[PDB]
Structure formats: C-alpha cells, structure tokens
C-alpha cells in the first residue's frame, strides 16, 4: 500500500513517541507510525491528516512501509515491553536495519540488546532522549550509542529534530560511543538533575528557615542569581513556581504541596553504577537519600515531636548571608559535576567507550532540564585537556573553589548550628576537603582490617603486600 | 574414613580458625582446601588436635560421618559457586551444607530455592569476629529452612561467642533463605560506618589538636572505658601502640592510606538504594574508601587546590570531649540507619527478622560489639514495630544531650578544612529525620512544572496536578 515509502518509523504512540514522530515529519520526512493498541495510532493519524504520516496496523505492515536500511525508533515502556517489541520486530527485519531505543533505559539492557541483535545483523542504537513531552515535539537533547556506521545514517535526522543550543545553534546531539554509551550518559544527566534539585532545595530551605524570607523575597533572590554565573533553567523554574497562587485555597501552591519526593524507579541508577565502579559520588547519592527520607513523612512528623534541636534567631547580615549561600550553591554544583564527569571517565575506561566529555556538556545546553550557562566552562576544561581527570584541576574551577570555599564553610557552620538539614552542602565541602587531602586516615582503616581480617596492606615506603602480626 | 563429626572447606584465616574452634569443642574435624599445601600446614602445625587431612573433595566427603555437616569458608562469588557445584554430587540426602562466607544474599536465595527439594539441607550463615572470633567464638547469623537450622543449632551454640552479660550464645535463627547473609551484610555496613567515624576522630585529634599517636592511643583507651566501649574502639587503641616491624616509628604511619573493600559495604548501600531506605552515613563511608583509592589524584590535587591553614587556639580537653560525644552520637546514627534498612528488607523479603535478637547476638564474637546493644534490644522488646531507634527514650536522651557538641565538632572541622563526610552526614540525617517539613515540596513543584509528575497536598487527600501555563 505504502511499501518502502517511509523514511523513518516510530513504534509507540503514547505522547512521547507521537511527539517524536511529529518532530521527524515536520523536518520534511514521511514517517511510519505504529502502536500495539491500534486506536491510538488511528487517533494520531486522524488528528494530523495533513502530515506525511503512514498509518500502519500490524508490525508486518509497519516494517513493509519503510525504506531500507530501515530506521525504527522504539518509544515503548522500558524493560520487558521493549524486549517484547524487539522480539516481535526481529523476524520481519533485514540485515543492516537499524533499531533505536529512545526510552529511559538502564544501560546494561542496551548493552545486552545490542550484542544479541548484532548476531542477527541488526544494528541497535540506545539513545537517551531528554526534554520530556515538549522536548520530544520541539527539540530534545539526545545521547545515542551503538554501531557508528549505522548511527551515521541516523545522525542527519537526529541533528534536525534535536534542540539547538541558543548560543550557537549547534544541535544537542552527538555520537557517544558503542553499545550502551548513550544510555549511560543519559543516566548521569538524570543523576545530576537529582543533585541540582536538592542543592536548590537546600538554598530555598536556608533562605526560608534561617533568614525568614517570604516566597516573594526568595523569588527575587533566585531571579537575581540567575542573571549571574548560576544562570540555569532549574533556577528559572524555581522562581516561576514561587510566584504561583494555590489553586484550591489561599497563599501559594508550593506551600500546599506535600513534602514527599517522587517515584523511586530509575533515580538510583547513577549512584548504583558509581558503587559498582568504585567511583566517589556522594553528592548525587545524598540527593537520592534526601528524596527517600522525605517519603518517610509519618516517621518525621512523630520524630519532630520527640527529638530536640536548636531554636536560634538569626541576627547577622541578611545580604551578606544571601551572597554566601549563592557561593555555596555554585561551589556545591561544581562538586557534583566534577564527581559526575569523573564517573563518566571511569565508566568510559571500564566499557571502552571514549566518551566525548566536552561534547556531552555542549549537548546539555538545550532540550534538557539541567541546561545552564556554566556547561561552557566544562567544555573549555576538556577542550584544553581531554584527559582531564577531574574538573576541579582546571584553572577556571580552581579559581572558583579558592574564592568560594570560605563562604561554603560559613554557610555550613551557620546551617548546622541552626539545625537546618543540608546533606548536599555538607557533602560538597567534605568531598572538596577529601579530594585535596594528600593523606587521609584510611591508613587506620587498613590497620583495623589487617588486625581483625588479615586483609593485608600496602606501605608508604616500599613496594609489596604486607601483613602485620597484631597478636 | 567416616571418623569426622564436622568438615571445613577453605583453610585460610577464617576456615582454619573455625576448624580449630570446632575441634576444641571435643570433635574430630575434617579439613580441606583447594591448595593442598595449606591444609598440610595446619595439619602439621596441629598434630595434637583431632583433625583429618584430606586432599580431594571425594576424600573430604568420605571422611565425614552421615548425616554430614560441611561448612564452607571460601572466597565469595565464583569460588564459592564452583566449590558448591563440585560438592553437591558427592553428597547424600540428609547431609547439611553451610555457606559461612560473605556471600551476596541473592546468591543464597537462589541456592536455597534450587536446593529446596534435593534432600540436602542448606544454611547460608554470616560469621563475624574476625580471625580470633573464628577461633574462640564468632557471632553467627544463619538463615534457611527452620528444620535445617535446628540440625546445626547445637554445634553452632557450642562454637559461638557467649555474651558476657548472660552467657547466651551469639547465634540465632535469622529467617528463611538469604536472611542470615543479609543480616551479616548490614552488620558490615554498620562496621564501615563506625570505622570511618573513628578515622575522622583520629584525623581531628591528629591534624587539628596536633596530638601524637601515644596521646591519641590514651584518648581511645579512656573512651573505651565509658559508653563508647566497643570492639572497634578497643582495636584502635591496640593498633596505635604498635611500632613498625620493618623500620622506625609506628606501623599505622607506614600503612598506605588506600582502603580496600570486599563488597559487603557496597552491597549494603545498593540494597538501601533498591529498598528506598535512606542510608547516607554507611554509603558515605563506602565512598570515603573509594576516594582513598584515588591516591595519585589526591596527591596532584593537594598541590593545586587551596584551603584553610588554621591553628587551633582553643581548649584541647573540652574539644576532645566534644569529639567523644559526637562520635557516640554518630555511631548511634549508623546503627539507627542499619536497623531501619533491616526493617524494610524484612518486609520486602518476608523474613520477619528478629531485630532485638540481632542486637543480642552482636554482644560478643562481633566486630560491631557496642555497649548500647542491650538498649537496642530493650527498644525492640518495648515496641516490636519500632520504626527507628531514634524514637526510643534511651536514644532520645543521648541525642538531646549530645547534639550541641556534634554541631560544634562539625563547625570546627569544616572551618579547619579537615574532611568529615560521616560526621556531617550524621547531623544532616538527625536534622532531616526530625524535620516535620522538608524542602521536597519545592522538588515536587519543579517535577510537576517540568514533567506533570503530580503531587499530594498538605491540606487534603488525593493527587493533584497544577496548571502551570
Ligand atoms: N507489553 C508491551 N508490549 C508492547 N508494547 C507495550 C507494552 N507495554 C507498553 N507498551 C507500549 O508502550 C507504552 C508507552 O510506554 P510508557 O509505559 O512509558 O507510557 P506512559 O508514559 O504513557 O505510561 C504504550 O505505547 C504501549 O502501547 P499501548 O498504547 O498499546 O499500551
Ligand atoms: N577461584 C577459586 N576457586 C576455588 N576456590 C577458591 C578460589 N579462589 C579462592 N578460593 C579458596 O577460597 C579462599 C578463601 O580465602 P581468601 O581468598 O578470602 O583469603 P586468602 O587470600 O588468605 O586465601 C582460599 O581458601 C582459596 O583456596 P586456596 O588456598 O586454594 O586459594
Ligand atoms: O566480614 C568480615 N569481617 O567482619 C570480613 O573481614 C570482611 O572482609 C570485612 O569487610 P571488608 O573486607 O569489605 O572491609
Ligand atoms: Cl556497538
Ligand atoms: Cl530533561
């Protein structure tokens, strides 16, 4: 009927896949659409009659409608549903065809699928897609990994549909590396997001609890902060939510939202990889635990009634302290990214990916929630030295930490004395102080392990493995 | 050769000592190790003991009286898997196989399911107390079929540490399948946490107060006489006495600050992430080990990154006491988190874990033996459904009285530039746990704004989405 007339195909007609299909079509392509439940495909086709969408009813029809080598983007429920969909497509495909997974997929699944399909001559591109539903329609940030030669055939469409960085128009997409490299980078993006949200939450909490600032006052502070080096979309969202009235009562909606952070699911993934890899990732991990502890609302309400803490009234200079919190925020953000890019470095070694670090920062500049102006300084760092082990060692970040650390320390002293919980700010300064310590007290830990366990140790003065007679 | 009442596989530090423990209780004990020369050493070094030297697995199995009791003390993972695989076909119905290693609990759960109808009794057990614990009396944490447990309970009780308080064996039934190995993992998590807190205390005493090893040795010694009375504090004051065996000065000073790990602390944090359990202190202590392995980077970074170069000008005695208070307070935070994890794991895997009993069997033969373990048991006696140790009267009191000193230690350390990831994590956890309201409301607003994720409200039931545009 429409045999081999479609340039590209999308499976999954929920909002994400639907929007991606419309995005690709709008760039001047005929797009085959498919969904397990046909009514949803029918609904998309009917409402977008003037677009070059090919309505297909079966997988056989879907596959038949596509030019070879076929380019097929899966936008289906992660896990079992993606494997079931892959399994359904496989008999119908030809050698050289290209499957693309745009779901929020756990990278080992992508690595497994990629290896299995390669045995059948089928290319597999696991792609991180950021920006949510609006990003899918208008321009996502994208992180593809898979066979390079297959990806080069997909790249022009991705570069067309991708978000364009507002500073230079560069598309927010690039090849990440083989197999699961793309979904790995997307995972780290999502960990980083968790960290950035907790850091802002701590800033808001300090302003509210210690300085006694109103929602309107706090809105104005974030606005002003966003005009400087902190310039980021999450801070923009923050000052936007602080404006809003409760839709079901007096005051502000933000004050009526129950303090139980959402979901579980996929947010732990970055932390779990860091643990597997021997990578220090304390900031993002504190952010995950901060969400978990918020879900323990009932216990916290009970605990608030029995446990004691300070009842301090702040008497210092508000303006001075606001600026100090601004410094602590940016410093702590720098700690989290340094840790996150160090994790990417280790993962790259472990999986042999040659991850393009500076480019990663470039493609995060638009079409994702963590977009922020300082991503440029991360790119400059890796432009200067692509083998940079850690961002903290780059001149630009060295200067910031030198000048900003004093403020962080003060902020930590103030918040801790006042009793306001700051797990990520405290973790930030602890990482800074650990990373720059030539000697850490892990010599004592090693002595203890050798004492009870005979685990042996290394010495400071000569090569070799040693065991002490403690008895 | 069916002379032997009990068999041990794995003749390294733990298995050798366990074998000798069992033999001392008036048994003849079969010994096996994959490298035969190791078995030969302990056989030769202990000819007065009733040990049976065996060189092959068929001989090992043959030397045991039926129903056979075989305990494995082998390297976790593939080593243990291959040993059990080689061993199973040699075994008879009614035989008992015990995995005493630090096996990742899911492996044990799988093993238990696979062996459920083989006629071979399987027990996965945690063993604590280190090399001397294995010899003189370990804490044991067995899981599996209750019927299987009952078969080994008598001999487990004989070899187990006995609590000094009441003489009770430091072994009890943990629960089905992998429960015992799960409890041991959490035990090690807590252990990592306390070891990092101790290292931070030592770092503060040495770097801020400028104290010598003898001075710090004496401090920990005095601390161990009070409520800080524990195995880890005891062995710290022992370690700090020792002189270098290959040169001048203290051995502790000649040990490279690169902490090793064999997976259990990592596995604890992984499980906490999986279960939705906030476990910041133990997890921070794992990352603290990780960052110590980045020695070359830290050496480079120390020459480039700047920080405070301040000189403590205050009263040393007062600050030492504040560190003591803070160390005890933070030790409590570590256990409270470990037990919160155990509660969530018990519910997830339907283990009905005996929290109070767990604290009891940790009273001896145990790396994490602490003075407040009885108060942990008292807390669970009072409320079997106790959600968190911090809600118990005994712990309410300590935190009330000690929280001020913690804030002072954190502030002093942070201004000085001395890294305290677990001390800061401890006060953060305390301040978060007691906050009726956290700033997660702002996070929920951001998520609804960007991704329509929805929220709950403070003032009414149901789920809501705001029209942000
Ligand atoms: N088991 C399965 N096999 C094949 N496709 C499946 C599937 N489970 C879910 N999907 C597809 O994947 C879904 C989208 O993934 P999702 O679960 O992330 O969506 P949403 O975010 O809207 O809940 C739907 O497109 C679904 O097809 P239907 O519209 O027919 O439900
Ligand atoms: N890959 C493997 N397969 C079978 N057994 C193994 C093994 N790796 C280790 N083991 C056994 O399990 C080990 C348990 O000790 P260990 O490895 O934790 O400490 P140590 O380094 O002191 O031997 C040893 O008993 C070992 O037997 P060998 O003496 O022959 O090494
Ligand atoms: O379980 C033990 N002792 O309690 C073992 O010594 C274990 O190896 C200690 O943990 P680690 O080696 O990961 O530090
Ligand atoms: Cl590939
Ligand atoms: Cl995003």
CA distance B230 to B227: 8
Catalytic residue among A25, A193, A202, A286: A193
Report long-range pairs for B51-58 (Cβ below 8 Å, ≥24 apart).
B51/B19, B51/B23, B52/B1, B52/B3, B52/B4, B52/B28, B54/B1, B54/B30, B57/B32, B57/B86, B57/B87, B57/B90, B58/B90
Closest CA to A56 of A11, A94, A98, A104: A11
- Residue limits of CATH 1.10.1040.10 in chain B: 182-436
CA distance B171 to B142: 8
- Residue limits of CATH 3.40.50.720 in chain B: 1-181
Residue recorded with tokens 């022992």 = B238
Closest CA to B188 of A453, A318, A355, A236: A453
- Residue limits of CATH 3.40.50.720 in chain A: 1-183
C-alpha distance from A412 to closest chain B C-alpha (Å): 7
Closest CA to A127 of A275, A237, A252, A20: A20
3-state secondary structure (DSSP) of residue B243: strand
Q: Does ligand 2 lie within 6 Å of residue B36's CB atom? A: no
Q: Does ligand 1 lie within 6 Å of residue A37's CB atom? A: yes
Strand A142-145, strand A123-129: pairing: antiparallel
Q: Does ligand 1 lie within 6 Å of residue A41's CB atom? A: no
* Contacting residues for A196 by C-beta, under 8 A, at least 6 apart: A232, A234, A333, A336, A370
What secondary structure, in 3-state letters, does B344-391 show? HHHHHHCCCCCHHHHHHHCCCCCCCCECCHHHHHHHHHHCCCCCCHHH
User: Terminus-to-terminus CA distance in chain B, angstroms?
Assistant: 83
User: Nearest bound ligand to CA A114?
Assistant: 4
In DSSP notation, A359-377 reads HHHHTTSSSSTT-BTTHHH
Residues B18, B159 contacting (CB under 8 angstroms): yes
Give all strands (DSSP E) within B105-258, no chain letters.
121-128, 139-144
B7 is in an annotated binding site: no
Atom 17 (ligand 2): residue with closest C-alpha?
Answer: B75
Atom 5 (ligand 3): residue with closest C-alpha?
Answer: A453
Instruction: Choose the mutation target among A265, A370, A445 for the interface with B, i.e. most B CBs under 10 Å.
Output: A445
- Residue limits of CATH 1.20.5.320 in chain A: 439-471
Residues A421, B432 contacting (CB under 8 angstroms): yes
Residues B204, B409 contacting (CB under 8 angstroms): yes
CA atoms within 13 A on the CB side of A130: 28
Backbone φ/ψ region at B466: left (φ over 0), alpha (ψ -120 to 50), beta: beta
Residue recorded with tokens 């898997």 = B81
Residue A424 corresponds to which tokens in the numbers above? 């990520």
Cα-Cα-Cα-Cα torsion B205, B209, B210, B216, nearest 10 degrees, comes to -30
Residues A71, A31 contacting (CB under 8 angstroms): no
Q: Does ligand 1 lie within 6 Å of residue A266's CB atom? A: no
User: Nearest bound ligand to CA A442?
Assistant: 3
All residues of chain B having their beta carbon less than 8 Å from the beta carbon of residue A290 are 278, 432, 438, 440
Q: Which atom of ligand 3 is nearest to the CA of B259?
A: 14
A186 is catalytic: yes
Count other C-beta atoms under 10 Å from residue B424's C-beta.
31
Residue recorded with tokens 């009780």 = B157
Alpha helices in B262-315 (DSSP H): 264-275, 280-293, 295-304
Instruction: Choose the mutation target among A208, A219, A443 for the interface with B, i.e. most B CBs under 10 Å.
Output: A443
3-state secondary structure (DSSP) of residue A9: strand
| Alpha carbon separation from B30 to A68, B68, B189, B364 (Å, rounded) | 68, 11, 33, 27
- CATH fold group of domain B1-181: Rossmann fold (3.40.50)
- DSSP 8-state assignment for residue A171: B
All residues of chain B having their beta carbon less than 8 Å from the beta carbon of residue A444 are 198-199, 202, 236, 239, 252
CA distance A102 to A20: 10
Closest CA to B294 of A383, A338, A272: A338
Q: Which atom of ligand 2 is nearest to the CA of B14?
A: 15
To test the pocket of ligand 1, the residue of A12, A19, A21, A87 to mutate (highest count of ligand atoms within 8 Å of its CB) is A12
- DSSP 8-state assignment for residue B34: S
Q: Which atom of ligand 2 is nearest to the CA of B38?
A: 29
- Residue limits of CATH 1.20.5.320 in chain B: 437-469
| Alpha carbon separation from B46 to A353, B29, B42 (Å, rounded) | 54, 12, 6
CA distance A278 to A284: 15
CATH number, domain A439-471 = 1.20.5.320
Instruction: Choose the mutation target among B244, B446, B455 for the interface with A, i.e. most A CBs under 10 Å.
Output: B446
Count other C-beta atoms under 10 Å from residue B255's C-beta.
23
Count other C-beta atoms under 10 Å from residue B190's C-beta.
27
| Alpha carbon separation from A140 to A19, A376, B164 (Å, rounded) | 11, 19, 65
Question: Would you say how long chain B is, in residues?
Answer: 469
* Contacting residues for B220 by C-beta, under 8 A, at least 6 apart: B233, B236, B237, B240
**Which positions of A make up the binding site for substrate?**
104, 130-132, 189-190, 194, 264, 291, 449, 455
Question: Would you say how long chain A is, in residues?
Answer: 471
B38 is catalytic: no
| Alpha carbon separation from B309 to A399, B414, B416, B423 (Å, rounded) | 18, 12, 7, 21
Structure resolution, Å = 2.3
CA distance A112 to B137: 46
3-state secondary structure (DSSP) of residue B309: coil
CA distance B188 to B127: 11
Closest CA to A173 of A192, A159, A152, A153: A159
CATH number, domain B437-469 = 1.20.5.320
Residue A247 corresponds to which tokens in the numbers above? 């839709």
Rg, chain A, Cα only: 25
In DSSP notation, A119-169 reads TTT-EEEEEEE-SHHHHHHH---EEEES-HHHHHHHHHHHHHHS-B-TTT-
Backbone φ/ψ region at A265: left (φ over 0), alpha (ψ -120 to 50), beta: left
Q: Give phi and psi for B111, each to the nearest 5.
A: -60, -50
Count other C-beta atoms under 10 Å from residue B172's C-beta.
22
Class of domain A1-183 as given by CATH: alpha beta
CA distance B2 to B65: 5
**Cβ distance of B396 and A244 shorter than 8 Å:** no
A184-438 domain in CATH 1.10.1040.10? yes
CA distance B120 to A325: 63
- Which residue among A261, A402, A460 sits closest to B256, beta carbon to beta carbon? A460
Closest CA to A299 of A255, A260, A257: A260
CA distance A192 to A141: 15
User: Nearest bound ligand to CA A352?
Assistant: 4
CATH number, domain B182-436 = 1.10.1040.10
* Contacting residues for A268 by C-beta, under 8 A, at least 6 apart: A288, B273, B274
- Which technique was used to obtain these atomic coordinates? X-ray
CA distance A30 to A234: 36
Residue A346 corresponds to which tokens in the numbers above? 């280790």
């Amino acid at each position: 009927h429409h045999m081999a007339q479609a340039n590209f195909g999308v499976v999954g007609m929920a909002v994400m896949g639907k929007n991606l299909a419309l995005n690709v079509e709008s760039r001047g392509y005929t797009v085959a659409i498919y969904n397990r439940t046909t009514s949803k495909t029918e609904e998309v086709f009917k409402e977008h009659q003037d677009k070059n969408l090919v309505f297909t009813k079966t997988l056989e029809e879907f596959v038949g409608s596509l030019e070879k080598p076929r380019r097929i983007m899966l936008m289906v429920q992660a896990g079992a549903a993606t494997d079931a969909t892959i399994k359904s497509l496989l008999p119908l495909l030809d050698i050289g065809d290209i499957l693309i997974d745009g779901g929020n997929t756990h990278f080992p699944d992508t690595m497994r699928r990629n290896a299995e399909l390669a045995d059948s001559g089928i290319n597999f591109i696991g792609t991180g897609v950021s920006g949510g539903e609006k990003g899918a329609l208008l321009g996502p940030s994208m992180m593809p990994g898979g066979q390079k030669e297959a990806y080069d055939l997909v790249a022009p469409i991705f570069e067309q549909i991708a978000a364009k960085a507002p500073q230079d128009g560069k598309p927010c997409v690039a090849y990440m590396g083989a197999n699961g490299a793309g979904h790995y980078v997307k995972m780290v993006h999502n960990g980083i997001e968790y960290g950035d949200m907790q850091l802002i939450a701590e800033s808001y909490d300090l302003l509210k609890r210690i300085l006694g600032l109103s929602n309107a006052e706090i809105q104005a502070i974030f606005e002003e902060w966003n005009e400087g080096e902190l310039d980021s979309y999450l801070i923009e969202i923050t000052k936007e939510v602080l404006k809003r009235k409760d839709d079901e009562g007096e005051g502000y909606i933000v004050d009526k939202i129950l303090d139980k952070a959402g979901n579980k699911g996929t947010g732990k993934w970055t932390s779990e990889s860091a643990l597997d890899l021997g990578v220090p990732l304390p900031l993002i991990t504190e952010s995950v635990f901060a969400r978990y502890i918020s879900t323990y609302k009932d216990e916290r309400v009970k605990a608030s009634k029995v446990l004691s803490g300070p009842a301090l009234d702040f008497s210092g200079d508000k303006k001075e302290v606001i600026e100090k919190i601004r410094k602590a925020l940016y410093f702590s953000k720098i700690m989290s990214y340094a840790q996150g890019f160090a994790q990417l470095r280790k993962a790259s070694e472990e999986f042999d990916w040659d991850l393009p670090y500076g480019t990663i920062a470039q493609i995060w500049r638009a079409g994702c929630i963590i977009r922020a102006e300082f991503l440029q300084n991360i790119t400059d760092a890796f432009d200067k030295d692509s083998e940079l082990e850690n961002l903290l060692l780059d001149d630009y970040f060295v200067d910031i930490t030198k000048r900003y650390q004093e403020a962080v320390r003060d902020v930590v002293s103030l918040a801790v004395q006042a009793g306001t919980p700051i797990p990520t700010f405290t973790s930030a300064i602890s990482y800074y102080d650990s990373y720059r310590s030539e000697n850490l007290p892990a010599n004592l830990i090693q002595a203890q392990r050798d004492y009870f366990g005979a685990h042996t140790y290394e010495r400071t003065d000569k090569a070799g493995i040693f065991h002490y007679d403690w008895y």
